[PDB]
């Protein structure tokens, strides 16, 4: 749609992807719906547990932007 | 062909097509490849500046799926 960076936020124990095809570096990571609203068919994905953080679809800086989900473009 | 969702990013002054036709809702619009490899014949569509924002074709969930080009079916 015409045009975001995604809030999300993950506690201790929350899960989370890591796309080892998409991240700019190996602390990256994005949540749920961002990679479910995304592309990583090929790619070398994981679920993790994320000790915390946030999600970086719609960083450039974090992300790889052909990694980003529908709603962070 | 045998089976998508356009990646198709705009920049700020970057022109695409709306259709209030096969619109989800108005602010979902395609791009100009994506436009021309679909029927807008009769459609209530128009050329505009997207201010930035993603191309909707293949997404059920912004595109109605007959205004869909024929590579993102
Ligand atoms: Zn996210
Ligand atoms: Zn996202
Ligand atoms: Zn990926
Ligand atoms: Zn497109
Ligand atoms: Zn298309
Ligand atoms: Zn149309």
Redesign the interface.
């Known amino acids: ?3 975001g960076v995604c809030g999300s936020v993950w506690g201790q124990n929350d899960i989370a992807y890591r796309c080892r095809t998409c991240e700019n570096d190996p602390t990256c990571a994005i949540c749920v719906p961002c990679f479910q609203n995304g ?1 990583h068919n090929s790619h070398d994905y994981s679920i993790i547990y994320t000790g915390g953080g946030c999600c970086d679809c719609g960083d450039e800086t974090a992300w790889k ?2 990694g980003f989900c ?1 709603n962070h ?1």
């Open positions: 749609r015409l045009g592309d932007p052909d529908s473009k």
